[PDB]
């Protein structure tokens, strides 16, 4: 046999192409939108203190 042993998190075969997925691909958009929200709030707060 070929001595390479693959390990997958979640694997499916959809359209002649094998597709995999880990545990963080689904959470990219909310995370990088939360970061933008915090960054935009910080400097707006820092612009006019009193």
């Amino acid at each position: 046999h070929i001595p390479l042993i693959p390990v997958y998190g979640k694997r499916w075969f959809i359209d002649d192409i094998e597709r995999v997925e880990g545990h963080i691909a689904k959470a990219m958009d909310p995370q990088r939108l939360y970061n933008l929200q915090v960054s935009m709030l910080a400097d707006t707060a820092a612009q006019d203190p009193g």
């Binding site: 958009d29 939108l33 933008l36």
Partner: protein
């Protein structure tokens, strides 16, 4: 365009519209009031490059002098607006004050001119704003996050 506006026609329109020099009120016309009017028109058009913006006026190339027989380059759709504004500016030479109807006509013509040069700049995305996974920034397009510049 249709008949080509000259610089002298615009000042004659302004002189006629307030019964200063026309064939249908009494009589008469003067030669110095023409040079003064044409120079006033030139200075007005120079100023209009700021607030109303460019509208296609043809300036004198090199020094010389404007001369009433020169072609203005304006479309015929603007002559009432330009003439009314010029009349308002040059009324005080003869120590006269405009009537309310003249002011109303001037405002209407100016509004028509303003309507034809709008922009509404339509602000863009920023540059740290993400573009979602829904439009496949990896394969179809490139550069996740909007450019927001150019």
């Amino acid at each position: 365009m249709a008949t080509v506006l000259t610089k002298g026609e615009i000042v004659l329109f302004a002189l006629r519209k307030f019964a200063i020099a026309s064939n249908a009120s009494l009589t008469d016309v003067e030669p110095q009031s023409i040079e003064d009017g044409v120079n006033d028109l030139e200075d007005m058009m120079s100023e209009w490059m700021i607030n109303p913006g460019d509208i296609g006026y043809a300036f004198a190339t090199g020094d010389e002098q404007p001369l009433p027989d020169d072609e203005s380059g304006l479309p015929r759709k603007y002559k009432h607006a330009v003439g009314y504004q010029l009349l308002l500016r040059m009324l005080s030479d003869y120590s006269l004050e405009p009537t309310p109807q003249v002011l109303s006509n001037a405002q209407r013509s100016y509004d028509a001119l303003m309507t034809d040069t709008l922009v509404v700049p339509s602000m863009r995305r920023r540059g740290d704003f993400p573009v979602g996974q829904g439009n496949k920034y990896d394969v179809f397009t490139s550069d996740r996050y909007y450019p927001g510049d150019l």
